[PDB]
């Protein structure tokens, strides 16, 4: 689709069989999901935001479906206020910003 | 233009004759720039995201040119780590997300 920015660009994503709401976010380098359990190996990382830094767990090569499109890539999990699809996954599903 | 997301979508802005570099951020409701003296009355505001909240000064009716497009609106000014164009102004320049 083409998505207006008059409202937040929220989409439904599916990960590990769960449905979540996530924000398509060109201002995020990575995809960051609210605290949740994922299988497999992970590494701790610190990420920065508008207000400071948070601790996250980095999981690699995780399948996710984003508003119809299969992607497989890295997911950070931690105390984000909203689920965020960042540029790493936006590029995988073919998303551009157009004006 | 059609902006791909392989790298951060950083653009030149012009505001009161000053050239700055800013990030096109579909995950920001509002535009927030690094401290700058702007003309007119301002009100204190708190804006939040990953890492918590920061205090800013809200100015209104501020003209700003983003990649050749003219806008006018609310600009927040504060200790953001990076200059951020949010949806308020991305809408004015006609921006959509496309995939």
């Amino acid at each position: 689709p083409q998505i207006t920015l008059w409202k937040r660009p929220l989409v439904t994503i599916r990960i590990g069989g769960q449905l979540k709401e996530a924000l398509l976010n060109t201002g995020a380098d990575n995809t960051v999901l609210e605290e949740m359990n994922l299988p497999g190996k992970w590494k701790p990382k610190m990420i920065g935001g508008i207000g400071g830094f948070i601790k996250v767990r980095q999981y690699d090569q995780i399948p996710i479906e984003i508003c119809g499109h299969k992607a497989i890539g890295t997911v950070l999990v931690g105390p984000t206020p909203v689920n965020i699809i960042g540029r790493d996954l936006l590029t995988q599903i073919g998303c551009t910003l157009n004006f | 233009p059609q902006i791909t997301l392989w790298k951060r979508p950083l653009v030149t802005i012009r505001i009161g004759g000053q050239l700055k570099e800013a990030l096109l951020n579909t995950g920001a409701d509002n535009t927030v720039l690094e401290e700058m003296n702007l003309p007119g009355k301002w009100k204190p505001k708190m804006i939040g995201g990953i890492g918590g909240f920061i205090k800013v000064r809200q100015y209104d009716q501020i003209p700003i040119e983003i990649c050749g497009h003219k806008a006018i609106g609310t600009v927040l000014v504060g200790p953001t780590p990076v200059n951020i164009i949010g949806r308020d102004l991305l809408t004015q320049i006609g921006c959509t997300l496309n995939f």
Partner: peptide, 9 residues
């Protein structure tokens, strides 16, 4: 909250 800027590790 309304500004979801995020910087890689």
């Amino acid at each position: 909250p309304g500004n979801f800027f995020q910087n890689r590790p």
